[PDB]
Design a binder for this molecule. Structure first.
Ligand code: SF4
Ligand code: SF4
Ligand code: FCO
Ligand code: F3S
Ligand SMILES: [Cl-]
Ligand SMILES: [Cl-]
Ligand SMILES: [Mg+2]
Ligand code: NI
Lengths: 296, 581, 112, 145
């Protein structure tokens, strides 16, 4: 046989959407990840042991496999109320996080929560929810953002680290280049319409029924790094834009506080080819029609 | 030592104190504490939500049209339900009517969630309470095959197959890396399945873990992605185009074909794997038809769900009946009104929040979410809870009451409501299902009954999927394609000041969003969530919530191994992020 | 497919057999052209299910192709359009451009 | 019982074969035998027992379904099936595992899909096709001459 690499999966303030995403994996199935690629040694959502039995597992794993396990973090620690906005075993969650990170070889920050702060960190951040990298400063942290990240992206990152026995290459922000190297807008199948100046202006208009661009409906694709437009969601079935809603920007830091989702993105170059050339033509056609005297 | 009487229970916190923290195989963070007497019987039960985020605070000042996206992130397990409640609320406030197809699709989104959520809970969350995974290694594959083939028409049942499953499991553990099975409760005397039944159960656990990913593809088609699909105020953003140019950019025939293929497969898995497994657990755990009754024979609540008539939330429209029963009087199902300030109210005298007067309950339109962490003397410190003080404030969960009554919500509650309202399908279904176990109707009011009702609901939802899909296609055949109303999309068309209620039945029970709009911005947004009801702390009368009631008078075979506590709690399907939000 | 719709490979220069599309031979019947070599599997079935479910032929363009799947061009919905309009092109196979999924216009793509 | 005596394959329950048999019975009871019409059924050279015929036909349906999955490997590396794409000088499917823009190339996620198809394909061939081939052999031995 062969031992699998020990994995400790802890939860702070979260919605458990990231865990849900993980088990959606089409290839490899989450079943096979757990069975054959890794040793998921601690995970509140799935484990049989509870209470003092769960505590014993936790202690045993991080002690036995000290320096050798991967710490996966879902959610984030609150700094408010001495950390008692999130209580684990009668103590501040942050204490668990720190204790887990001290023995980890590397840390995976699942989702926008662990990466950035996500919804609980939005104005006014009642609990002072804080991303992991602001609390843990002495360990490699791989940020895998998104709310949640794409299921198959999650598993691909796991399989990469198992197969190639190393961390994925990352940007200046700690995101894996492989899936976060480009923008949604740079691989969007509706760019043709964007580039032509063909936009949905209101829900279920003729533009919407032809799958025109959603830029004027607030799509935050132009400023969002993720794989949704190429890799797609749920075994490549769809992604937000394909089903008719603009990107919310859910992979980006503080995206909740970047104005309304239905407000246009700013500082994104946008000059339509057919929209501009139609204007140029009518401007010229109307100048002539005025001089000839067949105006209107 | 204190002792008092409530709802027929004698609450006594003398004796040995047991702490289960963390509660695992649930969504989010929960702590439970109990007291047991010399006979190892629970005499006191304490339900504690150990997390808070504060969505109700975060939504203040935002645009009502964005609300759904924020509140959807309340929970990734019951993903989508809060968004549905949200658009319901905002459309209620402004006075928006959505097109028929938008309603049907939303119904499909909800039914899909019911199917997925119930399935995953049954196996991945509640399952290992009933299935002794390590005991499966002792089974005989040939009889496992016989057992499975005696229960169901499911194809996957060969001796070779079960042998393969047992073999992988054998290999998995042989290394000492037991993973999620480590330090479990395997061998506990309350594990009653024969080895063959455990192997059948575990095999299905794996099959369910695989298949569940398929179900949510319906969410991906209509809502872009799962978890956390997309929605709009005024309908759905998934424009439909069947027969016109550019159908490649919308919900087309091919897209709907995919949806149809998932419906069939979902109904197939639930009916022939989950259903027989649910009955099977019932057969080998019949004493638990009498354990963890709690409030289910006294007080149950449902708001109702699945409006079959678009924009009509009346009794003639909701396919899932609403109503309340109190004082065990199931012959008088009472109507529910979410505007009435005298029905739904929330108390915080035993919760970590602040009111001007904590001795009174506040209707969500008068709701206040003011975090105040104040645990009292907990035999430790503010950052070290050794023992919660249930005399005072002990939870991040508010205490909802209906007309002052503590209620149970969820699948069992809904089933009782639907049954006693005389819904023919439910009556037949329950009757049939209980007949098969040779159990009286009262047997449903229990820990086992909750699990049975959950499974039956999945079957019910799977059937509804097809019904809704056919309804959609019928509209398309008639040239009715509209999926959004934008007449009132612009804030300029809204009343300067308005309020509304959005309600539905989430997988775990009655969900409500209460929203006030002023000058195009959210003024107040209050949520009362199902687990908020069930995991509720006590009120000024000292009345206990559904969890604490269900745990009362429970016998424990081994005090240090809280399998019984787990079984009862898990039967409720706790979602703690939902409860606290 | 392209065979029955247009002629496809056997009809190419110099068409040794004088292979002829169906609509050049049958002129008194409604003909639905579903071209492609071959057409997309799920497009084929979606057309079939449409005709069965709605009990009518799909609406067609001026060429007899169903508007639902042939009303737009590949280039109108290609996820690499961002690179096309930016002028980011693969110039030779397996260059850095190709490894980033740049546009294949200069490699001869007839998507447009 | 026959199927389970020949293979480890999971899909072998009595209920399953009964369902298959019923679908077929319904199918023909309409007189619309489709591809089965005017066949050679009952020919003396047909040597399988009724149970082996039911097993075979069920596997025919299972193969019809599953064959579509195998060619997904062609779709990854060659874009589509039937008729994937190729180039003189190698293959056009550029590979990017660990660098920016891997979304536009053959990446770990694409490869994971390929691996998942390979496992499923070997599993179907070894436990459905192989035993059925062996079974036809057992019942039609004169045809070895
Ligand atoms: S603005 Fe959005 S819909 Fe339009 S091309 Fe960019 S990512 Fe796509
Ligand atoms: S030319 Fe081809 S590769 Fe480039 S954007 Fe158009 S269809 Fe895509
Ligand atoms: N189901 C569910 Fe989640 C809870 N409680 C919600 O709403
Ligand atoms: S909203 Fe998130 S899911 Fe992708 S499409 Fe935008 S990054
Ligand atoms: Cl399946
Ligand atoms: Cl298969
Ligand atoms: Mg609330
Ligand atoms: Ni939930």
């Amino acid at each position: 046989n062969k031992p699998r690499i020990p994995v400790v999966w802890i939860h702070g303030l979260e919605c458990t959407g990231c865990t849900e995403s993980f088990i959606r994996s089409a290839h490899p199935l989450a079943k096979d990840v757990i069975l054959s690629l890794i040793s998921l040694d601690y995970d509140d959502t799935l484990m049989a042991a509870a209470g003092t039995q769960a505590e014993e597992v936790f202690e045993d794993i991080i002690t036995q496999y000290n320096g050798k396990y991967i710490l996966a973090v879902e959610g984030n620690p609150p700094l408010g109320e001495q950390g008692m906005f999130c209580i684990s075993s009668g103590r501040p969650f942050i204490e668990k996080l720190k204790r887990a990170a001290a023995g980890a070889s590397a840390i995976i920050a699942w989702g926008t929560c662990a990466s950035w702060g996500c919804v609980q960190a939005a104005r006014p951040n009642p609990t002072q929810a804080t991303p992991i990298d602001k609390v843990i400063t002495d360990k490699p942290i791989i940020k895998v953002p998104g709310c949640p990240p794409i299921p198959d992206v999650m598993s691909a990152i796991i399989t990469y680290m198992v197969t190639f026995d190393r961390l994925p290459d990352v940007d200046r922000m700690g995101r894996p280049l492989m899936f976060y190297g480009q923008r949604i807008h740079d691989k969007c199948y509706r760019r043709a319409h964007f580039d032509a100046g063909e936009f949905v202006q209101s829900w279920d208009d003729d533009a919407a029924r032809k799958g025109y661009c959603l830029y004027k409906m607030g799509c935050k694709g132009p400023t969002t790094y993720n794989a949704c437009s190429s890799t797609r969601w749920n075994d490549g079935v769809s992604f937000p834009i394909q089903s008719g809603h603009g990107c919310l920007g859910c992979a980006e830091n503080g995206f909740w506080d970047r104005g309304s989702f239905y407000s246009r993105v700013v500082d994104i170059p946008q000059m339509g080819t057919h929209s501009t050339a139609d204007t140029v033509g009518l401007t010229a056609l109307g100048v002539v029609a005025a001089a000839v005297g067949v105006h209107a | 030592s204190t002792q008092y009487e409530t709802q027929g229970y004698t609450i006594n916190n003398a004796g040995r104190r047991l702490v289960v923290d963390p509660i695992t195989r649930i969504e989010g963070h929960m702590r439970c504490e109990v007291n047991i007497n010399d006979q190892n019987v629970i005499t006191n039960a304490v339900s504690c939500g150990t997390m808070f985020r504060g969505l109700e605070i975060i939504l203040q000042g935002r645009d009502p049209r964005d609300a759904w996206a924020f509140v959807e992130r309340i929970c990734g397990v019951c993903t989508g339900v809060h968004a549905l409640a949200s658009v319901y609320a905002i459309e209620d406030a402004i006075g928006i009517k959505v097109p028929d197809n938008a309603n049907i699709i939303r119904n499909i989104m909800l039914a899909t969630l019911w199917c997925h959520d119930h399935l995953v809970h049954f196996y991945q969350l509640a399952g290992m309470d009933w299935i002794d995974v390590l005991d499966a290694l002792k089974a005989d594959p040939r009889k496992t095959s016989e057992l499975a083939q005696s229960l169901s028409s499911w194809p996957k049942s060969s001796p070779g197959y079960f042998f393969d499953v047992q073999n992988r499991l054998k290999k998995f553990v042989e290394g000492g890396q037991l993973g999620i099975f480590r330090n479990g409760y395997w061998g506990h005397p309350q594990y009653k399945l024969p080895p063959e039944a455990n192997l059948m159960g575990f095999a299905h656990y794996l099959e369910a873990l695989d298949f569940q990913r398929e179900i949510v593809k319906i969410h991906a088609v209509f809502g872009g992605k799962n978890p956390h699909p997309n929605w709009i105020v005024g309908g759905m953003p998934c424009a439909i185009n069947i027969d016109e140019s550019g159908a490649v950019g919308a919900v087309n025939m091919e897209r709907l074909n995919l949806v149809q293929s998932i419906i069939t497969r979902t109904a197939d898995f639930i009916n022939n794997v989950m259903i027989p497994d649910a009955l099977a657990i019932g057969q080998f755990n019949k004493p638990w038809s009498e354990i963890g009754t709690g409030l289910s024979d006294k007080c149950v609540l449902s708001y109702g769900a699945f409006p079959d008539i678009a924009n009509d939330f009346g009794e003639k429209s909701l396919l899932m009946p609403g109503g309340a029963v109190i004082n065990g009087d199931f012959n008088n199902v009472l109507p529910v009104d979410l505007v009435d300030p005298q029905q739904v109210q929330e108390f915080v005298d035993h919760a970590w929040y602040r009111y001007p007067n904590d001795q009174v309950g506040r209707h969500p339109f008068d709701g206040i979410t003011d975090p105040w962490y104040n645990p009292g003397d907990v035999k430790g410190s503010d950052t070290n809870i050794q023992q919660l003080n249930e005399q005072e404030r002990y939870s991040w969960i508010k205490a909802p009451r209906w007309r002052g009554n503590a209620m149970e919500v969820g699948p069992l509650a809904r089933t009782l409501i639907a049954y006693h309202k005389g819904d023919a399908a439910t009556v037949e279904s329950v009757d049939r299902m209980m007949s098969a176990l040779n159990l009286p109707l009262s047997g449903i009011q229990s820990t086992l009954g909750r699990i049975l009702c959950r499974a039956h609901e999945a079957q019910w939802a799977a059937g509804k999927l097809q019904y809704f899909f056919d309804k959609l296609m019928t509209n398309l055949k008639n040239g009715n394609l509209a999926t959004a109303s934008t007449e009132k999309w612009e804030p300029a068309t809204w009343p300067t000041e308005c309020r509304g209620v959005g309600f539905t039945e989430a997988p775990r029970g009655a969900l409500g969003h209460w929203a006030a709009i002023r000058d195009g911005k959210i003024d107040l947004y209050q949520c009362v969530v199902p687990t908020t009801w069930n995991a509720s702390p006590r009120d000024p009368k000292g009345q206990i919530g559904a969890y604490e009631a269900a745990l009362m008078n429970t016998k424990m075979a081994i005090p240090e191994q809280p399998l019984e506590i787990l079984r009862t709690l898990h039967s409720f399907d706790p979602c703690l992020a939902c409860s606290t939000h």
